[PDB]
Amino acid sequence: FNLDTEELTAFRVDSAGFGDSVVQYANSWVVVGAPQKITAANQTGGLYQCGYSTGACEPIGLQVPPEAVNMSLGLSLASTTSPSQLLACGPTVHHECGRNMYLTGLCFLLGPTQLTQRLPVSRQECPRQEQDIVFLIDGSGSISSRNFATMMNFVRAVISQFQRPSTQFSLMQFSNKFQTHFTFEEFRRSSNPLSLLASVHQLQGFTYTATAIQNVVHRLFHASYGARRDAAKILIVITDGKKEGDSLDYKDVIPMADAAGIIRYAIGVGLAFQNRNSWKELNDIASKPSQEHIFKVEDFDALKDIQNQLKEKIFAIEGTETTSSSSFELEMAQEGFSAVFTPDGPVLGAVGSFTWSGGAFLYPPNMSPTFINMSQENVDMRDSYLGYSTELALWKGVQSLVLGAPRYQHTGKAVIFTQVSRQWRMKAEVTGTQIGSYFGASLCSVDVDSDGSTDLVLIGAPHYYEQTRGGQVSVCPLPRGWRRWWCDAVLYGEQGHPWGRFGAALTVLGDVNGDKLTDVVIGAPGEEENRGAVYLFHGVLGPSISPSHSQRIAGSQLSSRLQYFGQALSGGQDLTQDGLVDLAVGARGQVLLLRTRPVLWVGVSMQFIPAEIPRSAFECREQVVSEQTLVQSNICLYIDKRSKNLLGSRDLQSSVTLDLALDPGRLSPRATFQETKNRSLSRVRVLGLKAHCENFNLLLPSCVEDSVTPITLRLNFTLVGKPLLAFRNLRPMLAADAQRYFTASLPFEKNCGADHICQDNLGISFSFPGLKSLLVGSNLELNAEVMVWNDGEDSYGTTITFSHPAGLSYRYVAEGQKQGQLRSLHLTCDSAPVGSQGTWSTSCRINHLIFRGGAQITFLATFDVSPKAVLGDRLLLTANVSSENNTPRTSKTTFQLELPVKYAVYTVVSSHEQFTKYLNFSESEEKESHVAMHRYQVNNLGQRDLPVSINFWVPVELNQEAVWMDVEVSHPQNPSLRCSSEKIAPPASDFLAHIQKNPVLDCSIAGCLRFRCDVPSFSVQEELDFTLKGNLSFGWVRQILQKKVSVVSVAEITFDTSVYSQLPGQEAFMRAQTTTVLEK
Amino acid sequence: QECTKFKVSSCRECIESGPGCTWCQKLNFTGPGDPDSIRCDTRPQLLMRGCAADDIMDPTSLAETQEDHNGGQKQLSPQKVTLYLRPGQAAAFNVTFRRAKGYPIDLYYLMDLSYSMLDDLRNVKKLGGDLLRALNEITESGRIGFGSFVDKTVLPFVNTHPDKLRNPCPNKEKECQPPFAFRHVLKLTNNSNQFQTEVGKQLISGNLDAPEGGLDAMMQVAACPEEIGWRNVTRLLVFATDDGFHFAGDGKLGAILTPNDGRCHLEDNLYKRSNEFDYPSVGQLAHKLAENNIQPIFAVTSRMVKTYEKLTEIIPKSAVGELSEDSSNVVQLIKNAYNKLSSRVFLDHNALPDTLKVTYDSFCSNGVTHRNQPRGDCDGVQINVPITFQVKVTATECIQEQSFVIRALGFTDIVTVQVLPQCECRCRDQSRDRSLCHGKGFLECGICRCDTGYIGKNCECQTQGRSSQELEGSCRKDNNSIICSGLGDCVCGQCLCHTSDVPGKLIYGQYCECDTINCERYNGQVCGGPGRGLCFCGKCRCHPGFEGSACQCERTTEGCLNPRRVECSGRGRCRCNVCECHSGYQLPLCQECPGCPSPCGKYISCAECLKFEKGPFGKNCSAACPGLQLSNNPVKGRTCKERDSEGCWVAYTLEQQDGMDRYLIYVDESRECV
Ligand SMILES: *[C@@H]1O[C@H](CO)[C@@H](O[C@@H]2O[C@H](CO)[C@@H](O[C@@H]3O[C@H](CO[C@H]4O[C@H](CO[C@H]5O[C@H](CO)[C@@H](O)[C@H](O)[C@@H]5O[C@H]5O[C@H](CO)[C@@H](O)[C@H](O)[C@@H]5O)[C@@H](O)[C@H](O[C@H]5O[C@H](CO)[C@@H](O)[C@H](O)[C@@H]5O)[C@@H]4O)[C@@H](O)[C@H](O[C@H]4O[C@H](CO)[C@@H](O)[C@H](O)[C@@H]4O[C@H]4O[C@H](CO[C@H]5O[C@H](CO)[C@@H](O)[C@H](O)[C@@H]5O)[C@@H](O)[C@H](O)[C@@H]4O)[C@@H]3O)[C@H](O)[C@H]2NC(C)=O)[C@H](O)[C@H]1NC(C)=O
Ligand SMILES: *[C@@H]1O[C@H](CO)[C@@H](O[C@@H]2O[C@H](CO)[C@@H](O[C@@H]3O[C@H](CO[C@H]4O[C@H](CO[C@H]5O[C@H](CO)[C@@H](O)[C@H](O)[C@@H]5O)[C@@H](O)[C@H](O)[C@@H]4O)[C@@H](O)[C@H](O)[C@@H]3O)[C@H](O)[C@H]2NC(C)=O)[C@H](O)[C@H]1NC(C)=O
Ligand SMILES: *[C@@H]1O[C@H](CO)[C@@H](O[C@@H]2O[C@H](CO)[C@@H](O[C@@H]3O[C@H](CO)[C@@H](O)[C@H](O)[C@@H]3O)[C@H](O)[C@H]2NC(C)=O)[C@H](O)[C@H]1NC(C)=O
Ligand SMILES: *[C@@H]1O[C@H](CO)[C@@H](O)[C@H](O)[C@H]1NC(C)=O
Ligand SMILES: *[C@@H]1O[C@H](CO)[C@@H](O)[C@H](O)[C@H]1NC(C)=O
Ligand SMILES: *[C@@H]1O[C@H](CO)[C@@H](O)[C@H](O)[C@H]1NC(C)=O
Ligand SMILES: *[C@@H]1O[C@H](CO)[C@@H](O)[C@H](O)[C@H]1NC(C)=O
Ligand SMILES: *[C@@H]1O[C@H](CO)[C@@H](O)[C@H](O)[C@H]1NC(C)=O
Ligand SMILES: [Ca+2]
Ligand SMILES: [Ca+2]
Ligand SMILES: [Ca+2]
Ligand SMILES: [Ca+2]
Ligand SMILES: [Mg+2]
């Protein structure tokens, strides 16, 4: 609520795209991208460096490399703090590979203590394509040697167009024999390959075309002859006539050429190929489609005409086996599309990589970059954009990357990766819901309590469609442990804006009001015809975020010239150097700084001298208003408990205006102020840290109609400390969720009788109906049934107060629908921290009613128990009862009740999949024993670092025969070698019959080994892996006279059940089971 | 039935206290010790107390059906409904829909013209005869238009190097044209010769980024009746492709952030500005096609159908069908489109302001018992078959007069509905009897209404004056209560509750016993805040769409339901847009129990049952594996691998869907033995 829309700074700069992206840099500058600015010939992208003191912006003088062409820099921005670093990107770097154009990505990495780096260091080299091409030469005698020479010069003609080393050739001549004139290996090594074409002479002879082809496929395209492993394989056959005398059919040989993946081109020379049958033979020589692969040549003259276009045809190379698809890799990743620093090093977003599946690059400190993405196993990730959005999640130590995929199956998805061993893997994933919702468009990690660890991540979807409002943000708790990631809460914008783009931009503004909880900003630049608006949200206690905004600043409210306000957000830094965080917001043509205002927390102390109005004063003496009685009100104001953001000057002095009001909102003001004739008094006083306390004198008349309703004094107050000494600082303000109206009661003494003394006697006593043990986090409400009774005076303003520790406090409950003899009663309560170390007092007035001196009343009081309430192992709460007439005596009515306290945990253990199920043997080798392994998997899913003890049961001896043998517990990772073993004699039973029905061997019949491995501190989210290993003997099976026996071990998690109790229901999950099968 | 008093100083304020609150006007019904509030109660209570029935004012909500003249059709009625709507009292009227009359029809074909569509292009070039032949079996004189799409022409969507921009199709060919977003092939017309003249005429083209920029097309389609023209009559579109589609947020890849204008910026019948605007959002066109009343048909490859299937819930007026790589059934497809497109009847409404709510019953003529859903929706409704949409209108406030339209989706028929508030009941006035209230006020339906300085059942007293002790035996609830309960300086046997000038603090009641604050709190607000509900005398009365002791929850269950539309898988149940998932099944929708003993080992027999037809469950199969369906294709779930009846490692994927012990299996046809 404290974002200041009055005293802002606005940087409007007419460079194309100025403000489409912006980040806070180095606690000094707001750095603005302008992706479409024309800085030079065919160069786009402009960067600006604005400062608050100046109020104007300067362009950043980068030496920008020519190899990258219209990157459009500024489109992507990022910044960090460890030392100050700016990372700028234009990920539309145009890159020409002759005929084709690509978008590689180039980022700059700047710093005030360093010189500018460039990521990736290498400029992206063109793909190239390794091709291996064999010419097959008909050398038969039907070809004139003047024609043969024309054809061979056509061969050098063609080879001259194929630049090696991407292209290699090999040559064979054929007829009635076959002549390898050079291998691929030889073509590569020569400094003038063409010289080998010269050293060749015609064979003459018959025509064995098919044999020559079979000869090529199994020889020239083998790696022994220099053929390259992964290379496009092409065979060019040139001939002047049919195969004739060929002992092999094309039908016989062709399959190996296709089986290996070799393109078959046919060049037929002469009118011998004009007719039906010769066309069909060319078809068998060439590959289908036969038009693409056959070319009819008139003499040996037209040969040179097709040359260039046959060139063109072979250059048109592509995979054809799976419908000539458009399957890519790292050509158009647009690396650096989404940028996000980490402690390991920068991370750049790969989007179009691997046919727009995506990923991202980590750049460790001055060493080999690594590429995060899902494996090629996950087919469905094509065309997703995984890496469009990238953000860092950080728990106590290990880093994690979240990446957003606008298009995952047209809906959206975001995926958490972490590091298994040294290798990145998917930790967990979560999807969008509405198709075209564009889930994953935005990413922001939120540390709600500022413990240094990301508590949850916000995920945008700014074109989400509902009839009235456009966008949303998913509030997703971090899973920890390899478990399903889920999302808790959906946010929305002020509706009436179906395409407002809510969830476009995000940013953590930090702690803004002083409450130790995090506040975040959300962009909706499409609202109000794309005028734009910004939302401010507060982080709830615990891991979640408020279902409602606490401030919505539409740029339309800010200015008549604002479009796309909130397109970009970067919050978190003291750019103005005035002590508080600032918010940087981009809009179409300008970037704005918004400031938080200080949020002061005022303490209010109210008391009267004396406690009550004695009849001595209230009584009449026949003269109206004679000898008015003097009573003092003493109020203290202090400003404390939430200084937090501030200290010293400005935290101190702050002037405040006071308004006192005697008997307010009533017709008959029964007191007045001595300082001024009137029920009301106002004055201007000075607060600093320790309170300001003041006596105010009340004149109450002699004759006063109402001596029952206590006289009430109320406190309206407002800050008027306009000139505070430092920073020319903003208007300090008061928490708008806090209260500004405060009351105090001046009761009267009451006539219990003209000849009666008045002693009030009240007693109180409460219980907790139905309650068994108390479990923090399972039991969230505490239901107190308070009985209170009157054995004395009639009680006016009956007031019950409770003593309870900070972790719980009273929640008003309503009951209704005729039900019960129960608490239908109206009343008023107040909780307030009191004392030295951690307790509170909740104080409750029965109003409307006079608690009569012989009746009792029982009523209900419910206390919300924080699931993270720190109570100790015992909870004690107390109860005081009194009237408005203030307990004039000694022994206290206090009733108190103290309980044992248990805390919730969530522990699970499971059978692992890597177990030797079904061992075997058969008739013969019973003496043989075989290595058997069972494995169990345990995980602390709860909230508390509790110690545990892991227990295992393993059949070792059945009726004297070894079953398992030499079992040990292997605990590899975190090898606290403590395990303990105890042999256990088995429940004496009729084991033939017992195994007969349900042939399973477990500890019910088997002498067992029990393993106890004590975990001294099974901290949350920790995983442990335990394995049971030992040779399973076969010899005992004959004892039981069955063929199909199985063998089972059990695991059970134990802990101190007096201190901790596992969450209800989900309690079976700490006892698990794994089975191996024996078969004769 | 039910009446809780808010401040009751007149007939109107009695009415604003709720639907069941009625007001007795009988003079001196007020007992000398029974003050004015008692006149506001349920009608049975006022009658039991002796109030004449004709003196009980009870404005009731009603609907007035003013049907629009004569001539035309008997398809949608009534055409004008005027509402006299009382807060909290539902005004329900009945809408009859009986489409029988056929109407003309315009069909506009949208052609993916990429390298993958040549086998479709040659075929559809020659079909214009069959198309008119099939249309005119049902409608009279159908019409045919044509446009085509590839993608945005800038990198990264199609290659922009001059040689490739020249021949974008594979180098293997000419007979291709430079890449384009949306080209316009002239107008819908009455000639399949004209169809041939211009449709056979133009060339196929090509793309780089696999998804199709066809949403730029449909936005330009719905924006250029000046350049295309549609008849108001049925307006159909056929989106046809082998590929997927681009949408909003993708244009950032080409450094073009500005979202779609929606304005025809057309030059020479081609989308020229397309590289300067992002793709429209999915909902952006669901809305724009609804504005101009267009039903898209999705003529896509079998491998895109599931994703186009999902587009019928964002735009209800659309149809989805699978068809061949040939386009060899686009006739049968469009026959099926119209058949089940016209089999749906949808009834929705204009933008209701927050003050109002409209809900629907929907009686399907084929026996579907259905009531209480915020959508008029029935299926399979034939020809000339009347169905029923009961329109229930309920308002919160004493609203301003206001008009809105309820419309059938797919048509330009309009039912104009007008809303009048029913707040001020009818009474006499200050011209009748200025003697009672002593000339310091006037009279309305019984009780005197007093001037600003006067009070009392007959305005006799004045605000600057006394009280009375024996009257203060009535000016308090009972012997053991406080006079006015505190919070009131008592006058003349009635209480005058105090002023607390703080937000939303009123003290009210016959004895100032109630307030607008001291109710249950949700989020950090009184009754969850003013949006979610209101606070009256210790209890929350929640607004439409909310319920709970503090308006804690939303009436909506859509939050507990999965895409299959079942609450909390089949493993939990629904409480406030939240599932409570039994055992280890996890949030949100209770699908997955990432922790349960994975059930592979007990489905050995079942897997080899169903693929390999062997194992112990031969002849036993179906009954012995009842929760399991077998899938032709790989499934998503749990990897299993284990030894069958003979010792072969059968590998299969086991995917639990909605229910207890209910699965899909993909079995690898390969065994693995030794
Ligand atoms: C997330 O990111 C990951 C990783 O970044 C992506 O996963 C990767 O996908 C890429 C897909 O393109 C893969 O790149 C291809 O790699 C081929 C060779 O792969 C590389 O690795 C070689 C060895 O790796 C395997 O083996 C090691 C052990 O040695 C093992 O540790 C690995 O895990 C890996 O294991 C494989 O096998 C197992 C089981 O078999 C399987 O589970 C795995 O998934 C793996 O498949 C290594 O030797 C290579 O290095 C050299 O070789 C290159 C050859 O071109 C050379 O250029 C390099 O300079 C280097 O010297 C290589 O690093 C490679 O063949 C592919 O090449 C095709 O595509 C390129 C373009 O990328 C084209 O230009 C080529 O022309 C070629 O296409 C042509 O040929 C094919 C057919 O290939 C011939 O063989 C047939 C017989 O098999 C013949 O009949 C036929 O006629 C052909 O002659 C045609 O189909 C084409 O149409 C065309 O004609 C390509 O570069 C990469 O390996 C893989 N990574 C891993 C770990 O698997 C994910 O995709 C990404 N996520 C998403 C969602 O996208
Ligand atoms: C990187 O950033 C640079 C910034 O400088 C970009 O440079 C701009 O690039 C564009 C091209 O993408 C230039 O576009 C221009 O084309 C304008 C009109 O286009 C129309 O005219 C063409 C004309 O060609 C035919 O007609 C003439 C008639 O004289 C004949 O000579 C020709 O042979 C053709 O028959 C048509 O072909 C076309 O279809 C359109 O109708 C024109 O106004 C411009 O002068 C220029 O030609 C733009 O001007 C460039 N600006 C600058 C300052 O360089 C560059 O594009 C970016 N990178 C990439 C890869 O594009
Ligand atoms: C139980 O209820 C009783 C009755 O209201 C509470 O007693 C009150 O306790 C407060 C302190 O919380 C006393 O205020 C004190 O005033 C003296 C005046 O000199 C001052 O020196 C102290 O520092 C303190 O401010 C108050 O006088 C006292 N009133 C009565 C009638 O006993 C009691 O506090 C409740 N229980 C607990 C645990 O506080
Ligand atoms: C620079 O821009 C011109 C167009 O003005 C373009 O022809 C040229 O290819 C661009 N860059 C290079 C490296 O040639
Ligand atoms: C012994 O175990 C092997 C696997 O290691 C299994 O294939 C075989 O079936 C077992 N023996 C017999 C006789 O089945
Ligand atoms: C234990 O088992 C392993 C492998 O199963 C085998 O090599 C070894 O000989 C066995 N030892 C005994 C004592 O049975
Ligand atoms: C048809 O509807 C259009 C709006 O798309 C409108 O311009 C036209 O007036 C309507 N037809 C007639 C005959 O008025
Ligand atoms: C068929 O299944 C039943 C239990 O479902 C089992 O008792 C019976 O043995 C099975 N039959 C065969 C031939 O395996
Ligand atoms: Ca935290
Ligand atoms: Ca805060
Ligand atoms: Ca600042
Ligand atoms: Ca096709
Ligand atoms: Mg020859």
PDB file of N, CA, C and O in Angstrom, chain A residues 96 98 318 334 388 407 438 484 665 667 812 814 827 850 852 917, chain B residues 161 172 245 248-249 253 479-480 489 499 518 520 538 583 592 641:
ATOM      1  N   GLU A  96      24.125 -15.657 -41.582  1.00  0.00           N
ATOM      2  CA  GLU A  96      23.959 -16.172 -42.937  1.00  0.00           C
ATOM      3  C   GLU A  96      24.954 -17.295 -43.190  1.00  0.00           C
ATOM      4  O   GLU A  96      26.169 -17.083 -43.117  1.00  0.00           O
ATOM      5  N   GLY A  98      25.411 -18.800 -46.205  1.00  0.00           N
ATOM      6  CA  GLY A  98      25.200 -18.815 -47.637  1.00  0.00           C
ATOM      7  C   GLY A  98      23.737 -18.696 -48.005  1.00  0.00           C
ATOM      8  O   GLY A  98      23.195 -17.590 -48.098  1.00  0.00           O
ATOM      9  N   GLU A 318      18.876 -33.773 -47.517  1.00  0.00           N
ATOM     10  CA  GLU A 318      18.005 -33.827 -46.352  1.00  0.00           C
ATOM     11  C   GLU A 318      17.683 -35.283 -46.068  1.00  0.00           C
ATOM     12  O   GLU A 318      17.713 -36.121 -46.973  1.00  0.00           O
ATOM     13  N   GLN A 334      18.541 -19.082 -30.162  1.00  0.00           N
ATOM     14  CA  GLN A 334      18.443 -17.711 -29.672  1.00  0.00           C
ATOM     15  C   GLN A 334      18.944 -17.643 -28.230  1.00  0.00           C
ATOM     16  O   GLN A 334      18.326 -17.047 -27.347  1.00  0.00           O
ATOM     17  N   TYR A 388      12.181 -20.223 -22.543  1.00  0.00           N
ATOM     18  CA  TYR A 388      11.577 -18.909 -22.741  1.00  0.00           C
ATOM     19  C   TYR A 388      11.640 -18.073 -21.470  1.00  0.00           C
ATOM     20  O   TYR A 388      11.924 -16.869 -21.514  1.00  0.00           O
ATOM     21  N   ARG A 407       4.487 -22.869 -24.744  1.00  0.00           N
ATOM     22  CA  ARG A 407       3.792 -23.615 -25.783  1.00  0.00           C
ATOM     23  C   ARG A 407       3.726 -25.109 -25.529  1.00  0.00           C
ATOM     24  O   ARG A 407       3.328 -25.842 -26.437  1.00  0.00           O
ATOM     25  N   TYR A 438      -0.505 -20.157 -21.932  1.00  0.00           N
ATOM     26  CA  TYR A 438       0.864 -19.654 -22.002  1.00  0.00           C
ATOM     27  C   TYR A 438       1.494 -19.645 -20.608  1.00  0.00           C
ATOM     28  O   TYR A 438       2.232 -18.731 -20.233  1.00  0.00           O
ATOM     29  N   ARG A 484       6.228 -34.774  -6.240  1.00  0.00           N
ATOM     30  CA  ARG A 484       5.401 -34.017  -7.170  1.00  0.00           C
ATOM     31  C   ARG A 484       5.336 -32.551  -6.762  1.00  0.00           C
ATOM     32  O   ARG A 484       4.961 -32.224  -5.632  1.00  0.00           O
ATOM     33  N   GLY A 665     -20.225   9.598  19.989  1.00  0.00           N
ATOM     34  CA  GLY A 665     -21.300   9.049  19.232  1.00  0.00           C
ATOM     35  C   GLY A 665     -22.544   8.806  20.046  1.00  0.00           C
ATOM     36  O   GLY A 665     -23.343   7.960  19.685  1.00  0.00           O
ATOM     37  N   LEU A 667     -25.594  11.015  22.741  1.00  0.00           N
ATOM     38  CA  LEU A 667     -26.149  12.358  22.828  1.00  0.00           C
ATOM     39  C   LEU A 667     -25.718  13.086  24.092  1.00  0.00           C
ATOM     40  O   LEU A 667     -25.586  14.312  24.076  1.00  0.00           O
ATOM     41  N   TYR A 812     -12.906 -15.276  16.391  1.00  0.00           N
ATOM     42  CA  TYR A 812     -14.347 -15.233  16.600  1.00  0.00           C
ATOM     43  C   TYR A 812     -15.010 -16.376  15.846  1.00  0.00           C
ATOM     44  O   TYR A 812     -14.737 -16.601  14.664  1.00  0.00           O
ATOM     45  N   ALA A 814     -18.906 -18.069  15.001  1.00  0.00           N
ATOM     46  CA  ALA A 814     -20.351 -17.930  15.035  1.00  0.00           C
ATOM     47  C   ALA A 814     -20.984 -19.313  15.004  1.00  0.00           C
ATOM     48  O   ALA A 814     -20.469 -20.227  14.351  1.00  0.00           O
ATOM     49  N   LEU A 827     -19.996 -10.931  22.307  1.00  0.00           N
ATOM     50  CA  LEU A 827     -18.903 -10.453  23.141  1.00  0.00           C
ATOM     51  C   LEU A 827     -17.792  -9.892  22.265  1.00  0.00           C
ATOM     52  O   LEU A 827     -17.810 -10.010  21.037  1.00  0.00           O
ATOM     53  N   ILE A 850     -25.929  -8.271  32.209  1.00  0.00           N
ATOM     54  CA  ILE A 850     -25.538  -8.183  33.608  1.00  0.00           C
ATOM     55  C   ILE A 850     -25.469  -9.607  34.136  1.00  0.00           C
ATOM     56  O   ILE A 850     -26.475 -10.328  34.136  1.00  0.00           O
ATOM     57  N   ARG A 852     -25.724 -11.993  36.663  1.00  0.00           N
ATOM     58  CA  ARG A 852     -26.443 -11.893  37.927  1.00  0.00           C
ATOM     59  C   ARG A 852     -25.847 -12.791  39.008  1.00  0.00           C
ATOM     60  O   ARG A 852     -25.438 -13.930  38.749  1.00  0.00           O
ATOM     61  N   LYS A 917      14.074 -59.664  -7.406  1.00  0.00           N
ATOM     62  CA  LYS A 917      12.833 -60.408  -7.286  1.00  0.00           C
ATOM     63  C   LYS A 917      12.921 -61.635  -8.180  1.00  0.00           C
ATOM     64  O   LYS A 917      13.341 -61.536  -9.337  1.00  0.00           O
TER      65      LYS A 917
ATOM     66  N   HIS B 161      16.374 -15.319 -46.058  1.00  0.00           N
ATOM     67  CA  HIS B 161      17.469 -15.084 -46.988  1.00  0.00           C
ATOM     68  C   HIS B 161      16.903 -14.985 -48.399  1.00  0.00           C
ATOM     69  O   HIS B 161      16.059 -15.806 -48.780  1.00  0.00           O
ATOM     70  N   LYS B 172      14.221 -28.466 -54.530  1.00  0.00           N
ATOM     71  CA  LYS B 172      13.793 -29.437 -55.522  1.00  0.00           C
ATOM     72  C   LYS B 172      12.812 -28.883 -56.566  1.00  0.00           C
ATOM     73  O   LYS B 172      12.496 -29.614 -57.511  1.00  0.00           O
ATOM     74  N   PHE B 245      -0.315 -24.523 -34.447  1.00  0.00           N
ATOM     75  CA  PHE B 245      -0.607 -23.111 -34.651  1.00  0.00           C
ATOM     76  C   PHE B 245       0.131 -22.239 -33.641  1.00  0.00           C
ATOM     77  O   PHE B 245       0.341 -22.630 -32.489  1.00  0.00           O
ATOM     78  N   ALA B 248      -0.423 -15.871 -29.134  1.00  0.00           N
ATOM     79  CA  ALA B 248       0.176 -14.694 -28.517  1.00  0.00           C
ATOM     80  C   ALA B 248       1.360 -15.071 -27.640  1.00  0.00           C
ATOM     81  O   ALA B 248       1.400 -16.147 -27.041  1.00  0.00           O
ATOM     82  N   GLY B 249       2.331 -14.160 -27.565  1.00  0.00           N
ATOM     83  CA  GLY B 249       3.566 -14.405 -26.861  1.00  0.00           C
ATOM     84  C   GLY B 249       4.653 -15.048 -27.692  1.00  0.00           C
ATOM     85  O   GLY B 249       5.812 -15.061 -27.262  1.00  0.00           O
ATOM     86  N   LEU B 253       9.752 -13.827 -30.135  1.00  0.00           N
ATOM     87  CA  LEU B 253      10.919 -14.476 -30.722  1.00  0.00           C
ATOM     88  C   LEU B 253      11.462 -13.700 -31.914  1.00  0.00           C
ATOM     89  O   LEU B 253      12.653 -13.803 -32.230  1.00  0.00           O
ATOM     90  N   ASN B 479     -34.886  -8.312  32.124  1.00  0.00           N
ATOM     91  CA  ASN B 479     -34.441  -7.961  33.471  1.00  0.00           C
ATOM     92  C   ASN B 479     -32.923  -7.967  33.590  1.00  0.00           C
ATOM     93  O   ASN B 479     -32.344  -7.112  34.270  1.00  0.00           O
ATOM     94  N   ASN B 480     -32.261  -8.936  32.961  1.00  0.00           N
ATOM     95  CA  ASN B 480     -30.834  -9.153  33.153  1.00  0.00           C
ATOM     96  C   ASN B 480     -29.979  -8.477  32.089  1.00  0.00           C
ATOM     97  O   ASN B 480     -28.760  -8.674  32.074  1.00  0.00           O
ATOM     98  N   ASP B 489     -28.280   5.809  23.790  1.00  0.00           N
ATOM     99  CA  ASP B 489     -28.875   6.740  24.747  1.00  0.00           C
ATOM    100  C   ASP B 489     -30.390   6.693  24.552  1.00  0.00           C
ATOM    101  O   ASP B 489     -30.907   7.152  23.526  1.00  0.00           O
ATOM    102  N   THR B 499     -23.238   6.317  17.604  1.00  0.00           N
ATOM    103  CA  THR B 499     -22.443   6.503  16.399  1.00  0.00           C
ATOM    104  C   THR B 499     -21.001   6.100  16.675  1.00  0.00           C
ATOM    105  O   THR B 499     -20.345   6.673  17.550  1.00  0.00           O
ATOM    106  N   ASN B 518     -18.883  -7.404  14.018  1.00  0.00           N
ATOM    107  CA  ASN B 518     -18.490  -8.519  14.875  1.00  0.00           C
ATOM    108  C   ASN B 518     -18.980  -9.863  14.324  1.00  0.00           C
ATOM    109  O   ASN B 518     -19.671 -10.629  14.994  1.00  0.00           O
ATOM    110  N   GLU B 520     -17.531 -13.371  11.679  1.00  0.00           N
ATOM    111  CA  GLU B 520     -16.311 -14.123  11.423  1.00  0.00           C
ATOM    112  C   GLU B 520     -15.483 -13.458  10.332  1.00  0.00           C
ATOM    113  O   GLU B 520     -16.007 -12.761   9.457  1.00  0.00           O
ATOM    114  N   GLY B 538     -23.434 -10.570  14.069  1.00  0.00           N
ATOM    115  CA  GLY B 538     -22.589 -11.690  14.416  1.00  0.00           C
ATOM    116  C   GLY B 538     -22.476 -12.774  13.368  1.00  0.00           C
ATOM    117  O   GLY B 538     -21.750 -13.752  13.592  1.00  0.00           O
ATOM    118  N   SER B 583      -5.441 -41.518   1.475  1.00  0.00           N
ATOM    119  CA  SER B 583      -4.116 -42.120   1.447  1.00  0.00           C
ATOM    120  C   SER B 583      -3.074 -41.081   1.037  1.00  0.00           C
ATOM    121  O   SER B 583      -3.207 -39.888   1.347  1.00  0.00           O
ATOM    122  N   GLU B 592      -2.370 -38.500  -8.464  1.00  0.00           N
ATOM    123  CA  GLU B 592      -1.139 -39.239  -8.226  1.00  0.00           C
ATOM    124  C   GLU B 592      -0.885 -39.427  -6.733  1.00  0.00           C
ATOM    125  O   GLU B 592      -1.070 -38.499  -5.940  1.00  0.00           O
ATOM    126  N   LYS B 641       8.529 -53.853 -14.991  1.00  0.00           N
ATOM    127  CA  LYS B 641       9.383 -54.811 -15.690  1.00  0.00           C
ATOM    128  C   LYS B 641       9.505 -56.031 -14.794  1.00  0.00           C
ATOM    129  O   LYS B 641      10.010 -55.912 -13.674  1.00  0.00           O
TER     130      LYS B 641
END
